[PDB]
Amino acid sequence: ATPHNSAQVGDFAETVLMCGDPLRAKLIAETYLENPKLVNNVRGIQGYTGTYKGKPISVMGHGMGLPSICIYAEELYSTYKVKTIIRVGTCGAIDMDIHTDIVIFTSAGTNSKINRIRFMDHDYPATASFDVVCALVDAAKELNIPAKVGKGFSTDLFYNPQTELAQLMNKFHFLAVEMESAGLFPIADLYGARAGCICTVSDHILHNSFQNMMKIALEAAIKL
Amino acid sequence: ATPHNSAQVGDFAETVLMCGDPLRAKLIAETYLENPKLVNNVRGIQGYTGTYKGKPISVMGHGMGLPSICIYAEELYSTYKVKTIIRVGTCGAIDMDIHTDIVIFTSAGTNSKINRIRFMDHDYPATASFDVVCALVDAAKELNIPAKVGKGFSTDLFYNPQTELAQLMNKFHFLAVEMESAGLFPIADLYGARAGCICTVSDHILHNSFQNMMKIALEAAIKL
Amino acid sequence: ATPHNSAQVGDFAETVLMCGDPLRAKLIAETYLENPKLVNNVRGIQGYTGTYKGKPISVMGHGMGLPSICIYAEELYSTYKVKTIIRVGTCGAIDMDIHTRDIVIFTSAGTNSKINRIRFMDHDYPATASFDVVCALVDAAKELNIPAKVGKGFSTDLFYNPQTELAQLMNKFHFLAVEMESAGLFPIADLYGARAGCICTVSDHILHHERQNSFQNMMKIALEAAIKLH
Amino acid sequence: ATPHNSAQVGDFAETVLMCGDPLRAKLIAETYLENPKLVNNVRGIQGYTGTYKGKPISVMGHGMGLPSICIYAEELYSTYKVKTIIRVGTCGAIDMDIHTRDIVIFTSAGTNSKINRIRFMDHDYPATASFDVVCALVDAAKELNIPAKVGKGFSTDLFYNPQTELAQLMNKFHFLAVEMESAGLFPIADLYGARAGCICTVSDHILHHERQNSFQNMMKIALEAAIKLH
Amino acid sequence: ATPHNSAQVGDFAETVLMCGDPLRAKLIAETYLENPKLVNNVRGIQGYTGTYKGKPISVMGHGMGLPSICIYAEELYSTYKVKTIIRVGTCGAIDMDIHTRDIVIFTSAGTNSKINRIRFMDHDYPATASFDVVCALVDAAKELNIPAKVGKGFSTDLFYNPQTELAQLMNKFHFLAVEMESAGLFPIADLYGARAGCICTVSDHILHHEETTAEERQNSFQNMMKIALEAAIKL
Amino acid sequence: ATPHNSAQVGDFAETVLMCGDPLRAKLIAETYLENPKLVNNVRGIQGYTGTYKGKPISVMGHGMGLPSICIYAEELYSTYKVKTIIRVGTCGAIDMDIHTRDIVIFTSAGTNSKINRIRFMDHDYPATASFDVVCALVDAAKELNIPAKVGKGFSTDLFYNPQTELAQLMNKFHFLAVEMESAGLFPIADLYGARAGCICTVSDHILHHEETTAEERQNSFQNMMKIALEAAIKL
Ligand SMILES: Nc1ncnc2c([C@@H]3N[C@H](CO)[C@@H](O)[C@H]3O)c[nH]c12
Ligand SMILES: Nc1ncnc2c([C@@H]3N[C@H](CO)[C@@H](O)[C@H]3O)c[nH]c12
Ligand SMILES: Nc1ncnc2c([C@@H]3N[C@H](CO)[C@@H](O)[C@H]3O)c[nH]c12
Ligand SMILES: Nc1ncnc2c([C@@H]3N[C@H](CO)[C@@H](O)[C@H]3O)c[nH]c12
Ligand SMILES: Nc1ncnc2c([C@@H]3N[C@H](CO)[C@@H](O)[C@H]3O)c[nH]c12
Ligand SMILES: Nc1ncnc2c([C@@H]3N[C@H](CO)[C@@H](O)[C@H]3O)c[nH]c12
């Protein structure tokens, strides 16, 4: 019922986990949901609606990059009346004290122009919902997994011609880099809904985890 | 051998077709290649190396949006030594005289900041290779299929808050909108390689084809 | 010790509460701090150090606007070794469900200044309050039974904003409130690996014509939050 | 009929060849057009109409820079009903394989002007020559055995460019050459649903110190291309 | 009246001297205005109306940086009907032949704030002192007998400027000094039909400092106050 | 010498009058300079060196728009060692009390070109006329007995301006007129230590035109030429 989603109003749990990799969405179909009903495979995007400890979850891939996640997220909140999107994903460390760890974003800077286009060319600060951030932090806490908490940078360019930037992000204690959150968070605000992100280091840009990250995300889903 | 590509130097034909939809890459695996060898399924991205009329082709999905295609294309030209990328795809009409037709891009404007980042914040004109554009035009001509030739607009935002823009693109005779070419073309330039795009109207933003578009792209691949 | 501050090292506590009005700073020093010493009066800015429930605490004005709070915040984190600065201010409400004298706690702050674009290679820097501090303010307010909204704020360069359709747009994106300083504080604290946060009182609504108790309430939340952060 | 043009309707052919130097325009009128009538001399700009192999053709200067060619191109497409304007210019080569007096044909043109950002909601407008015309120029040059490179050009606002690392960057992206007008012509033609193209002669290399024949060669290619486009 | 000013139309004169430092406004009011009345002290900004050689004059602080002088300059012109604002403060040395305690008269000022871009469709607004005021200031400084350079200033949003190359660039283009308010004050005068000018004494030097003390920079810069008040008399 | 100028150091005087229209440079040279020598006519730009009341003067076209006056102003200051450039052209009426044939003296000029952003780290450069020249021009126009307004101009990159709201905005901020070269000419003088000023006569009006003919706008605007040459004498 949307150019990128065949599923119908109700086919989606009020809470969706989303990742970049569509095969990873399946992995957790599949490895945590009970009664994994496929609900979207347009563009092979692996949409599922299920339950975890009796609560209706969903998982789905979002594509690599802001423009992609901006498509999915807007559709989910608007059409499929989703209340909460948590991006579980991978990212690259900037902070010298973060290592191949779990990171929970409070916000995400960006080199994209998308937020300038939706905000009269001023600075929109892309902020994770304080609800969700707390939810993730807490869960991480119960399950006794260390998590870092802080800023992300959503890059439009995985191979960044602007090489002086990794260091500058370091200088300002940016935690890590990925390519989607700065797109998500303001869509969430726009629909009065909520979003958050987390959060695993799969490489360091200045020189188990899947399981931990997913238990935290799922435990957190529950509180929300 | 690249974070997004498991295949190896040689696994890719000097010429790759690429589309947004990874299931569509398969469709033409699959429907035109002979001896479809899978060469990449990281993130389910459907990479194939084959032959068409005895020439080594490849097909692959590129994701929706500049940041996505920028990842694939840069990797293909640099790592996998690809010489030519033709984006076969779908797009949305702006021009009042274009209808649910085939369009061949000579170039693509954009609301992305990616080209400003690679070009000292000046205007890079994202231009399809005149080679390829001619190749497509000619083929379209032999196979007796009408094609339109002209400008595209690569949007970062499928649901564009800036609603006055469809009309302004109309006023300047923009042909159609999609979300990838403006990312591609300058990468092509950067590696001294070549790229082009085309090209099918799947909706009009102001109010067979697959088969035709693919025969033109494949015929054209051959001349290149 | 700086062109804007005549204190020496040691003279400021590790936590400094700052507000725009230097006379409000003075009012706080006389009302909430015991044994307030005037440590800075350059430009009439009223900086004091004292204690609150045995814990060391400072208060100082910052003037109005990013440029001014940028001078004083960088000086504190850099010359004086401050660890934490909580803004205690007033703001104009935007979100239609926020009312005069309501109390807002900022997760982060948008801006129309060019300052962070200059600090950050012309990219979008998200000015975020430190997590600890947002939490401490939220805990304080719950312990004291003062209700507090949590959310994005917006720091404008222009109090009389000729961009008249901006208010609405912010509303559409659920910005709680507008003030004129947080977007500058946050990234400076990040730069000195220090902490910052901001708490405010709604003194007026920008979307439709609209005290002490409020001020008093915010001060308690800020001061108790300072205690927990120490 | 305009502040910059004293011709009336009818006075220009459907195809107008324009170059920066008004005396070059005059040189073209006297050398290639038969029965050249001076139709415009406001500001010394030298516009003529005549014929070439029985086909109607005009030539006029445009001055140096986007702003100037923007005045004259819009006036021609709008007041005079011109259908096609080919720039016939000189340029500085960039690409290391292009040499003095080589001939370049532009598929499109980058720019550092703000003009297209103003025309296009601050987005990236790709100034592209019309396909027909690029083709006609390429066909003409092949029929006449003059070799011609095809590629991106770049129109700078600043002949003496204080951005000294720009030349290299353009080279890295395989821009053929720099002139100071095409980026302005193309989008105006799009706006009047007309056609435009640009052909140039390399008068100098910007990447390392470096005639008539060349000029003559370009003129033939342009004039034959005009014939085919008619 | 305004949220930042508790006086009322009539309380301020038609000419107002302003500086960043309210304590320096207070020194001016005390050292030079016969019969100073405190007209406004919200935020401790020290606004006073008195008279100088028999003509009404006012003085008030404006705080540091564009956002702040913007708030006060616009209230003065709009609500309090002021006709002339002369800014008398400190810079900001860039020129190599200019030194601390030197005097500098701004014709205009560049900036790095988005403010003028925001009030002017994102183009380059020339923040320009009124020709009258420049001349007055220039005359006054020629009569009293004090040397003053005339030229351009630059209002920075960032006293601690991370762009460290910018100072040499300004030097190439021969800017005189750097401050933090004039680029905001001039387009506001333009917007209200009123006049504005800016005179400042050098308090440090950015290329080969050089310095100055909080006290001497608060009390030791009479002269600019002198030229400013003589200039005021004429206008 | 330069690619745009075939004269040589010495051929141009130290003061050059310039206008967009080379035919108007040629009228000035013919109507006013004793013993005009044609020093430069590459691109038909009409540069001449002669003398006026016994002082050396020069005159040359500069073409329309920032990119062009930029090319010539920089060659004059850099290679030909010029000391002063006075631009005498047309505008550009914005102010409602200004009308065709009226005279306008620019203190500075806003712009919408990226040029000043590019030579100034992307901030707001105040493109400012030299105070000397403004004064000279102002004096000359007071002596000869001709009325002239002093104020700000705006140099547009787009004579046909698609931003149709911009003219009223300029009006709010009281700009005098609109032209297409001054914002480029002033920072170049600054860069070379030299001086520049701009005087123009109103050739059309943007808010309630009003017009003028190619001929009267080419030949009928002596006066500005008069003030400019009197001003030149002083400088
Ligand atoms: N070093 C790094 N730079 C930028 N992005 C990432 C990522 C994330 N993984 C995908 C691209 O590899 C994309 O969806 C990002 O969110 C992992 N490592 C990264
Ligand atoms: N109306 C329209 N607006 C923008 N984009 C498109 C597209 C293309 N299809 C994908 C998104 O639906 C993406 O890869 C685009 O290239 C089709 N129709 C479009
Ligand atoms: N409605 C409103 N719009 C913008 N700013 C504010 C403020 C804050 N108070 C000072 C100026 O009023 C300044 O320091 C701002 O932080 C209070 N209400 C506001
Ligand atoms: N090296 C070079 N750099 C920039 N521009 C050019 C030109 C062109 N000739 C005129 C100025 O020289 C102007 O109209 C430009 O189009 C020729 N060579 C060039
Ligand atoms: N080096 C310098 N950089 C920037 N600004 C200044 C100033 C001016 N004095 C105040 C605080 O320094 C501020 O209001 C500025 O106007 C003096 N020296 C300066
Ligand atoms: N309405 C108007 N808009 C913009 N520019 C002008 C001019 C000036 N005259 C030349 C061509 O019109 C150009 O060189 C400008 O300097 C006169 N009237 C103007």
TrEMBL record, chains E, F:
The keyword Plastid does not apply. GO terms for molecular function: purine-nucleoside phosphorylase activity; uridine phosphorylase activity. One of its GO terms (biological process) is uridine catabolic process. Residues 16-226 form the Nucleoside phosphorylase domain. GO terms for cellular component: cytosol. Keywords: Glycosyltransferase, Transferase. Gene3D superfamilies: Nucleoside phosphorylase domain. Signal peptide: none annotated. InterPro entries: DeoD-type (IPR004402), Nucleoside_phosphorylase_d (IPR000845), Nucleoside_phosphorylase_sf (IPR035994). Pfam families: PNP_UDP_1. It comes from the Eukaryota. This is Purine nucleoside phosphorylase, putative.
